């Protein structure tokens, strides 16, 4: 099709000027056209926000009915991603709108799962995913492919959080085969590394470094690796050149703390941890916060709170961390396994 052909040539013959050429081309397409519809998903799937936003504004005041719906549904997704709205506000706007497109009906169920994943709320994510059939789509084949990759990466993160890690890798490797879009490969590799964080140190670093190379240049994608490598190395007590000492973000400060413990500077770690407790953070965050306090004080109550927050978050992978500490402090292994399952 026009868009697919355009993109495939830009990629194969001008790979290094893809954004510059596609940005210009996509912004000169007529809002009402099938190509302008394919263009909006390209911009959002590649996380080209400034472009996606210009495309949404132009296609929201459009005459084609499919082009106007796309802009309206994505407008909510862009507001949820930018942090202007709540997952429930978004869920309300989706029920209010009457979606006539089978395509903007599958995207509607995915729009919330992205906020759910970002804020440690994994509980509501798996059910929505089962309301999606990509055979209900037949007019755009560019989207069905992009939505197909989008679902595999979401399904990998869902299986990762359920401790079904063989299924997580299978769905991330499927996505890596299904696409050439950078964000999907970057998030596929990141999910594979997090799936090996306890199983195999080497394979976690190999898949995290494979993603870091693809992300290189996108500072926002790079940061996901610098954070996870930083974590991987602090858990296996290894040299960690991936720590950001300049960031105030909770998840970053948590990595500075995990290093001070590995270096046995507990007084500075507990001071920095205590200042974090007052700060706004999700339930998943607090599972890690109390795991760190337990490593400094060896208080079983801290490991218990870690277990509690991981339980709320519904994180069946990272709950293993406090569970293992409790095993080594001679807590009953059978009870620890029931809390894991």
């Amino acid at each position: 099709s026009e868009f697919n052909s355009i993109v495939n040539i830009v990629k194969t013959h001008y790979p290094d000027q893809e954004y510059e050429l596609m940005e210009n081309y996509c912004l000169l397409l007529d809002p009402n056209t099938k190509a302008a519809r394919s263009a909006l998903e390209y911009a959002d799937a590649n996380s080209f926000n400034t472009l996606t936003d210009k495309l949404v504004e132009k296609m929201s005041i459009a005459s084609n009915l499919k082009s106007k719906e796309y802009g309206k549904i994505y407008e909510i997704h862009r507001k949820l991603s930018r942090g202007e709205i709540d997952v429930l506000e978004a869920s309300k706007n989706i029920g209010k709108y009457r979606i006539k497109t089978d395509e903007m009906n599958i995207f509607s169920k995915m729009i919330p799962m992205y906020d759910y994943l970002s804020k440690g709320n994994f509980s509501p994510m798996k059910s929505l995913l089962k309301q999606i059939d990509l055979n209900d789509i037949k007019e755009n084949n560019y989207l069905k492919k992009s939505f197909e990759t989008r679902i595999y990466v979401l399904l990998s993160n869902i299986y990762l959080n359920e401790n079904e890690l063989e299924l997580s890798r299978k769905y991330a490797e499927k996505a890596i085969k299904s696409t050439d879009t950078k964000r999907f490969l970057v998030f596929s590799y990141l999910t594979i590394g997090t799936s090996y964080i306890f199983s195999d140190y080497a394979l976690s670093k190999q898949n995290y470094l494979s993603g870091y190379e693809i992300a290189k240049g996108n500072s926002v994608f790079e940061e996901f690796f610098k954070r996870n490598l930083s974590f991987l190395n602090n858990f296996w007590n290894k040299e960690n050149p991936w720590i950001n000492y300049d960031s105030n973000a909770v998840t970053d400060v948590q990595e500075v703390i995990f290093e001070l413990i590995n270096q046995k500077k507990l007084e500075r770690a507990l001071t920095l941890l205590k200042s974090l407790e007052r700060k706004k953070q999700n339930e998943n965050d607090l599972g890690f916060h109390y795991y760190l306090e337990g490593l400094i004080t060896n208080d079983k109550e801290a490991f218990y709170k870690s277990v509690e927050y991981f339980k709320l978050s519904q994180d069946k992978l990272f709950i293993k961390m406090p569970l293992i500490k409790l095993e080594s402090l001679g807590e009953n292994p059978r009870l620890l396994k029931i809390i894991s399952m």
């Binding site: 993160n157 999910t191 997090t194 996870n228």
Partner: peptide, 6 residues
């Protein structure tokens, strides 16, 4: 802590 994305 760890980070996730899709």
């Amino acid at each position: 802590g760890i980070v996730r994305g899709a």
